[PDB]
């Protein structure tokens, strides 16, 4: 399944998507993304958009 990410980091702002087999992998997936690019923010998720955001 296709989830969504919305940016609203510092500097990092934006979306990506990721194709992953259910919602807890893409949390995953999306973590490790923005923890790489050095944001460090608050998330939600909504199940029913498949859409989480990061926000600084």
């Known amino acids: 399944m296709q989830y969504k990410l919305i940016l609203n980091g510092k500097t ?3 979306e990506t998507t990721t194709e992953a087999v259910d919602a807890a992998t893409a949390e995953k997936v999306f973590k490790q993304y ?3 690019n050095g944001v460090d ?3 939600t998720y ?3 958009t498949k859409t989480f955001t990061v926000t600084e």
Do not use: F, I
Request: proline share 0%; charged share 40%; no cysteine.
């Open 41 to 43: 923010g608050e998330w």
């Open 12 to 14: 990092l702002k934006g």
């Open 34 to 36: 923005a923890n790489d």
């Open 46 to 48: 909504d199940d029913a």
